[PDB]
Amino acid sequence: TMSLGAENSVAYSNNSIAIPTNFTISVTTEILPVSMTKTSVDCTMYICGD
Amino acid sequence: KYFGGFNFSQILPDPSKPSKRSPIEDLLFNKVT
C-alpha cells in the first residue's frame, strides 16, 4: 500500500511555541520549457512524393 | 480538540465512520454522482 510519508504528531497546546534557532539556505532548481522545435512541412512533397 | 474556541468538527475527519472523512465531505461525496 502506498505510504504518504512518515506520521508526525505536532504537540499543540495553548502555551507551546516553536521558534527556530538556526537557518539553512537551500538552492533548488526548476526546469520549465519556454519553447519547442519550430517545424514546417511541405504539403506537396509529403502528400505527393515525386 | 480545543483549538482556541473554534469548532472544526465539521472539517476534521470523524472517527465514527469507515471512510474517515469529515461531515462536510460526506455531503460532497453524496451530492456529486
XYZ file of C-alpha atoms in Angstrom:
83
model
C 0.000 0.000 0.000
C 1.339 3.432 -0.943
C 2.650 5.369 2.043
C 2.136 9.134 2.173
C 5.265 9.651 4.283
C 6.051 9.233 7.952
C 3.480 10.254 10.563
C 4.125 13.283 12.759
C 2.217 14.489 15.832
C 2.720 18.233 16.328
C 2.321 18.853 20.066
C -0.382 21.520 20.032
C -1.118 23.457 23.212
C -2.166 26.874 24.485
C 1.389 27.736 25.604
C 3.580 25.885 23.089
C 5.564 27.862 20.507
C 8.336 26.587 18.214
C 10.706 29.377 17.183
C 13.655 28.185 15.052
C 17.192 28.886 16.229
C 19.280 28.264 13.086
C 18.687 28.533 9.336
C 19.689 26.564 6.243
C 19.926 28.446 2.936
C 18.923 25.935 0.253
C 19.099 26.356 -3.527
C 16.549 24.357 -5.521
C 16.038 24.028 -9.269
C 13.037 24.201 -11.597
C 13.110 23.195 -15.264
C 10.370 24.923 -17.248
C 10.077 24.662 -21.045
C 9.967 28.015 -22.814
C 9.951 26.954 -26.466
C 9.665 23.900 -28.707
C 11.112 22.916 -32.078
C 9.690 25.184 -34.782
C 8.541 22.786 -37.508
C 7.381 23.346 -41.079
C 6.154 20.676 -43.504
C 5.725 20.830 -47.282
C 2.241 19.771 -48.369
C 3.243 18.827 -51.915
C 6.286 16.649 -51.214
C 4.780 14.908 -48.174
C 1.428 14.005 -49.742
C 2.610 13.617 -53.353
C 6.147 12.263 -53.236
C 7.627 12.714 -56.718
C -9.653 19.456 20.045
C -9.946 22.774 21.913
C -8.330 24.908 19.206
C -8.813 28.301 20.837
C -12.596 28.159 20.673
C -13.288 27.480 17.000
C -15.213 24.259 16.338
C -13.536 22.366 13.482
C -15.720 19.277 13.955
C -17.308 19.661 10.514
C -13.968 19.766 8.666
C -11.854 17.359 10.752
C -12.162 13.634 9.903
C -14.839 11.962 12.013
C -13.541 8.716 13.579
C -17.023 7.144 13.843
C -17.184 6.103 10.178
C -15.295 3.656 7.927
C -14.380 6.332 5.355
C -12.579 8.551 7.916
C -13.946 11.677 6.236
C -15.491 14.879 7.611
C -19.223 15.690 7.841
C -18.849 18.290 5.077
C -17.019 15.833 2.815
C -19.806 13.304 3.410
C -22.272 15.738 1.837
C -19.919 16.235 -1.115
C -19.437 12.525 -1.873
C -23.230 12.020 -1.775
C -24.330 15.101 -3.733
C -21.901 14.679 -6.634
C -22.677 11.495 -8.559
